[PDB]
Subunit: 217 residues, 4 copies
């Protein structure tokens, strides 16, 4: 399962542990019980605020995204991350270039096409300078500081269902930057495919965001 | 699928697992824009990570356990915050007559006034009386959340535990150690055993370069 | 500042870092930024779900509570704890004995005041058996396993305003066991004194519980 | 307490709760005696009993380059609040490495040229950013052309235990030089507020390699 986001990014599901029944399973222990009834428990827990059972469902994603996007994403402390290093590796020529449609809805002095053009020009000069510094023997950890925030980076993300839901509440929302919204939708799609009952219950009883109720999957 | 019996009626049962040794290898490699490789190389990285103290990669390995243990053991266990728990409720369900009765050998080394067997006998008695009082209150209409307050700390409880490899190793350092209570140690050995079965490379590397305990 | 809870328990403030303005300062370092403007920002943050700024206010409490209460309290992982050790020190003769009014509203085959008695009896026999074992040479970590769940323990609790609010949402609520609700009420009271603005705003826009809305 | 770091950065102590005695009070669970108290701090540090130090909390105000902040924010056991590029107009403040930063590395161009190369690109980037903002492009979009050396500010609230982990990892030669400088500043303040804990830390638990070589 891999989903393309923006111009060069993506969200890919690396691994998953458990399913909706994992949460049903965990929840049952409270009443010395085990695993149509199970589906009803998910709703109950969701609408009543029993979030802990969903912590036993865990996902590991492989994400390709712009650093300005990663910086916001990494603010979610209840999860695990492992990212590409700008200190250790030679960064490749890959940057997020917004399409003219990105400025749809805003009045600008210069054409959307020009805006897209200027971002590219800057990206191009920045990367050349970066390579020139490295070729000259400048340490990678120093040379990379001239690279812009729209530079693509990669990382693994292991997070459980409760934290992922908090993530969707905050990122699969209109107040979050459009770019991370797009990633959140892909995360939602995958979440829905692996835990359909929890997902449906989540949208109907606890989701606090606004876009997942208008945009399918 | 794994089950280890602990104490007289307890147990540690592996319910699920996500990833294996290579899950940490994958996570780690990404820092160099690389992926997996041969076994010799990948296994070398794991020990490398363990040696230098790079533990984040091991967080991508997650375990889900089903544990049955006495409350005094569980209390110490739930002190490990970097994990998830779901436990049997004394407020909601009627508790079963199951308590941890120490065997006479638990007193080995300690010279006692009364024979060990007697200590065992006395523990069972108090437990029996407490439980009868509990059943008595429950059957007379007393709310369960109130009636259970007479139950002793050796009452058995059950819970689910989802924890990743890194937090798990911290658990073993602290609980797979002679400084921890013998009872919790036994559970830690069972946890280590399962960790060994599922992530051989990580475990071995752990024991050789990071494990700070003494019983493993 | 100390508040007694139940028959022998309590909640006392040990220390606190910051106040309503601590949250105001944390948040202002976002837009690169007086009373009305500040208290309004606080109500604004609370109303929209911007909770991180409240993490910069921290409290440390000293709590004396029954273990069954502590087992529920310790489930709140986003915080720090340090409790008395039952295997290191001899436990004192202090247990939570519910008052007859605790069974109020319930129809029981045994008079409430009789239930109170049965609980005391167990406590007494369990504790004596415990001292009997210890004096007999049984190590404390083993002898104490016969003690009941209403045995009082003590601990230090350091938590920030955000986690504290999650705690009040879940514990200062009728779905929580009454005994812990009482402690949560005490926690809320101290929190109100130190952060009136944050507290006021919490009740009005984020508080999900029910009893703080009536007590 | 405010310490200048790099060319435009700084570490400022905003607030602090408790001191060395706070860890002591927590460990004993009560509420003095330097001999015993300090001895206890060292005992706790020597045997790995770290939870008591979580009762000591700091709030810092930091100004640092995004590439430094990104590494810093990887420390999850803490609280943060940073300036927003989506909401605020960014100031013309970037970290420009001085020639000395390249002492020891053999380059095909004079270290001063590297400084100029970096300064020029930073200048171009900021100028395009300003033109984008002026023409009407949304802040959150216009700032994506800004370099990783753009300075940002944030509030950091962390307890002594997590801060000690931070020092282990950052006040070390393996961490990038730029964040090492901040860690030193963090260490000075910590040392100033909790002299007993810091000394005990350096003596028994610290895993880094610079704090035992550089005063305060
Ligand atoms: C021999 C022994 C004796 C003990 N005696 C006592 C006692 O007398 N009183 C008592 O109350 N407890 C006692 N404990 C419990 C101990 O204090 C810890 O609570 C327990 O070991 C859980 O460990 P942890 O904090 O390392 O783990 P977790 O809570 O699971 O945390 C794992 C890691 O994340 C961290 N971490 C998590 N949360 C925070 C935070 N809020 N701030 C900073 N870092 C954080 C640390 O790096 C930690 O090692 C004892 C434990 C042992 C093994
Ligand atoms: C009325 C009531 C009934 C209950 N019944 C039961 C029961 O039958 N069985 C049982 O085991 N427990 C039960 N609990 C305990 C409950 O499951 C929680 O453990 C407890 O409320 C502590 O809450 P918390 O997880 O929200 O808080 P904290 O552990 O303090 O966490 C605060 C916040 O950080 C989060 N968080 C922390 N750690 C993680 C993580 N690892 N993954 C994802 N998010 C995380 C969430 O956003 C959370 O709200 C009950 C509680 C109440 C109030
Ligand atoms: C020299 C150096 C090189 C690095 N290289 C890379 C790299 O190539 N790629 C990369 O992505 N990162 C890299 N990092 C970042 C590193 O992986 C950690 O994210 C960073 O050091 C923050 O540390 P921490 O996990 O110990 O701290 P915190 O996140 O603050 O956590 C403190 C303690 O609580 C714990 N803890 C917190 N959360 C969890 C959890 N979810 N599960 C288990 N335990 C938990 C542990 O006991 C931990 O030590 C590097 C750091 C250094 C110092
Ligand atoms: C529209 C929008 C605007 C934003 N603007 C800003 C800004 O201007 N400046 C800025 O710095 N950030 C900003 N953020 C980031 C925000 O402050 C959070 O850090 C981010 O959403 C991650 O969320 P979290 O804290 O809920 O999640 P996580 O860090 O993953 O935590 C999940 C849950 O555990 C909890 N938790 C975890 N750690 C702690 C802790 N240490 N103390 C108490 N509770 C804890 C809470 O219950 C939390 O919801 C913004 C986010 C959004 C969506
Ligand atoms: O929508 C947002 N999402 C987010 O995660 N932040 C966090 C990210 C970063 O640590 C700092 C400033 O981010 P921006 O430049 O993207 O606004 O606060 C801020 C905003 Br607004
Ligand atoms: O070895 C120990 N392990 C542990 O987790 N505690 C925590 C458990 C409980 O929250 C409180 C008191 O525990 P004991 O009564 O078991 O000592 O401190 C204490 C000790 Br000593
Ligand atoms: O209201 C509750 N609060 C709580 O914290 N638990 C946690 C406490 C303990 O770890 C386990 C069982 O608790 P009780 O016996 O008190 O129900 O689940 C359960 C319930 Br119901
Ligand atoms: O020393 C380091 N410190 C750090 O915090 N990272 C984390 C920061 C970021 O999330 C990602 C890539 O960082 P660099 O570009 O700085 O290498 O891994 C990496 C290295 Br190496």
């Amino acid at each position: 399962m891999k989903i393309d986001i923006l111009d060069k990014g993506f969200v890919e599901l690396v691994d998953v542990m458990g399913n909706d029944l994992s949460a049903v399973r965990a929840a049952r222990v409270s009443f010395d019980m085990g695993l149509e009834r199970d589906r009803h428990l998910i709703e109950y827990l969701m609408k009543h605020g029993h979030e802990t059972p969903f912590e036993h469902i865990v996902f590991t994603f492989h994400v390709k995204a712009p650093i300005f996007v990663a910086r916001q994403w990494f603010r979610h402390r209840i999860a695990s991350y492992n990212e590409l290093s700008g200190r250790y590796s030679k960064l490749s020529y890959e940057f997020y270039i917004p399409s003219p449609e990105r400025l749809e809805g805003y009045k600008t002095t210069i054409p959307p096409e020009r805006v897209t053009e200027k971002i590219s020009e800057i990206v191009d000069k920045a990367y050349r300078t970066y390579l020139e510094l490295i070729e000259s023997g400048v340490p990678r950890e120093v040379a990379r500081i001239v690279l812009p925030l729209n530079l693509y980076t990669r990382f693994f993300w292991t997070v459980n269902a409760r934290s992922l839901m908090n993530f969707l509440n905050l990122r699969a929302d209109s107040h979050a930057q459009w770019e991370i919204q797009q990633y959140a939708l892909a995360i939602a799609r995958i979440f829905k495919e692996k835990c359909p009952w929890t997902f449906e219950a989540f949208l109907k009883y606890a989701y606090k965001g606004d876009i997942l109720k208008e945009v399918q999957v």
